[PDB]
Design an enzyme around this catalytic site. Structure first.
Site, PDB file in Angstrom:
ATOM      1  N   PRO A  91     101.044 -69.584   1.464  1.00 21.23           N
ATOM      2  CA  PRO A  91      99.953 -68.584   1.610  1.00 21.23           C
ATOM      3  C   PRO A  91     100.583 -67.228   1.862  1.00 21.23           C
ATOM      4  O   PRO A  91     101.634 -67.124   2.508  1.00 21.23           O
ATOM      5  CB  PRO A  91      99.110 -69.038   2.764  1.00 21.23           C
ATOM      6  CG  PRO A  91      99.260 -70.548   2.679  1.00 21.23           C
ATOM      7  CD  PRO A  91     100.681 -70.747   2.301  1.00 21.23           C
ATOM      8  N   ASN A 132      89.863 -60.304   0.158  1.00 23.00           N
ATOM      9  CA  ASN A 132      89.737 -60.947  -1.127  1.00 23.00           C
ATOM     10  C   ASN A 132      90.591 -62.214  -1.117  1.00 23.00           C
ATOM     11  O   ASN A 132      91.794 -62.159  -0.863  1.00 23.00           O
ATOM     12  CB  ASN A 132      90.210 -60.032  -2.250  1.00 23.00           C
ATOM     13  CG  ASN A 132      89.305 -58.873  -2.515  1.00 23.00           C
ATOM     14  OD1 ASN A 132      89.721 -57.704  -2.462  1.00 23.00           O
ATOM     15  ND2 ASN A 132      88.106 -59.138  -2.903  1.00 23.00           N
ATOM     16  N   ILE A 144      97.998 -71.265  -2.833  1.00 19.13           N
ATOM     17  CA  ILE A 144      97.843 -72.388  -3.746  1.00 19.13           C
ATOM     18  C   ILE A 144      97.002 -73.456  -3.052  1.00 19.13           C
ATOM     19  O   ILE A 144      97.476 -74.132  -2.143  1.00 19.13           O
ATOM     20  CB  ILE A 144      99.201 -72.954  -4.200  1.00 19.13           C
ATOM     21  CG1 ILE A 144     100.022 -71.899  -4.931  1.00 19.13           C
ATOM     22  CG2 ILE A 144      98.973 -74.206  -5.057  1.00 19.13           C
ATOM     23  CD1 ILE A 144     101.478 -72.287  -5.090  1.00 19.13           C
ATOM     24  N   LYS A 184      99.399 -75.118   6.405  1.00 13.88           N
ATOM     25  CA  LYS A 184     100.690 -75.110   5.746  1.00 13.88           C
ATOM     26  C   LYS A 184     101.805 -74.791   6.727  1.00 13.88           C
ATOM     27  O   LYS A 184     101.563 -74.152   7.753  1.00 13.88           O
ATOM     28  CB  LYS A 184     100.666 -74.067   4.620  1.00 13.88           C
ATOM     29  CG  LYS A 184      99.666 -74.367   3.539  1.00 13.88           C
ATOM     30  CD  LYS A 184     100.075 -75.567   2.709  1.00 13.88           C
ATOM     31  CE  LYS A 184      98.997 -75.948   1.728  1.00 13.88           C
ATOM     32  NZ  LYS A 184      99.389 -77.045   0.846  1.00 13.88           N
TER      33      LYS A 184
HETATM   34 ZN    ZN Z   1      92.598 -59.436  -5.808  1.00 11.73          ZN
END
Ligand code: ZN
Ligand code: ZN
Ligand code: ZN
Lengths: 114, 114, 114
Positions: free
Chosen positions: A1, A97, A64, A32
């Site tokens: 991440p 985001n 992921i 993770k």
């Molecule tokens: Zn983006």
């Protein structure tokens, strides 16, 4: 991440230990290992949110997997909490985001994660 | 919507009022309320476009909806116009990446938009 | 194609000519003319990778096409090789996010590439 925060808060207002705290908290939240977590803070930015230059943050989280409706709600509460407590940014002046990356679309160590 | 412009134009060449102009014109073009518009300008960057360090810009617009072929052409005309008039960047030295975001993948105010 | 590298390596450690080397080698890897390649290097960043602040990099490559499992592996080898040789960053401390863009979602020259 991997997590980036872009903010107009000044560099001196970012606490010592903030990168380590983001690493640990994101490791816990995503589940993770911390070895796979990358963090990036960019203070002193020329930015506005709703036309206002009061403290704000524009952020990205790429991972992921570990991205989805409930998980992203949880991440948002966590991360807005941290930005409020540590950087004194109101949660309603933060955008994050979330991008769920395919393993073949993340390069690392001369190859990809596929 | 969230708009970022990264440029090699120096900070002193970014005119007073530019964040406000971007906020206003993006609100109008996207149809979104100005309160939801965030803008971010990053000058003084080490960048090249076509191998050249003449003025250029690399940009991103994220939005929940209001992204598509005709809308994106409109946004490009607007944003390249602004970068040309205000920052003196040729339109042919600007790239804008448009990203249509699912509401569940945008964090705001301790939650997401879903 | 457009490539950004964010790194904690200091500006003075970025060698002369590096933007030009990135442009050239990305042109060749993607097969696209160098006139269409844009590059952006952001040094002196406040970052951590796996909990530590030894040299690292967080990167993005956006391209209209020329993205896929084998291509991305080849880009990663190329780019990690450059970051190791020129910026002294270990390949295992580099992440590269690959984004295949639709032509209608890239603004340029007052319109899009559609
Ligand atoms: Zn983006
Ligand atoms: Zn993008
Ligand atoms: Zn990305």
């Amino acid at each position: 991440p991997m997590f980036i925060v872009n903010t107009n808060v000044p560099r001196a207002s970012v606490p010592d230990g903030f990168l380590s705290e983001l690493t640990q908290q994101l490791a816990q939240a995503t589940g993770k290992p911390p070895q796979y977590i990358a963090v990036h803070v960019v203070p002193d930015q020329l930015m506005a949110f709703g036309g206002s230059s009061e403290p704000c943050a524009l952020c990205h989280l790429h991972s992921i997997g570990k991205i989805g409706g409930a998980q992203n709600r949880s991440y948002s509460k966590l991360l807005c909490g941290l930005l409020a407590e540590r950087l004194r940014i109101s949660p309603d002046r933060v955008y994050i985001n979330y991008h769920d990356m395919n393993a073949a679309n993340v390069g690392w160590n001369n190859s990809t994660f596929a």
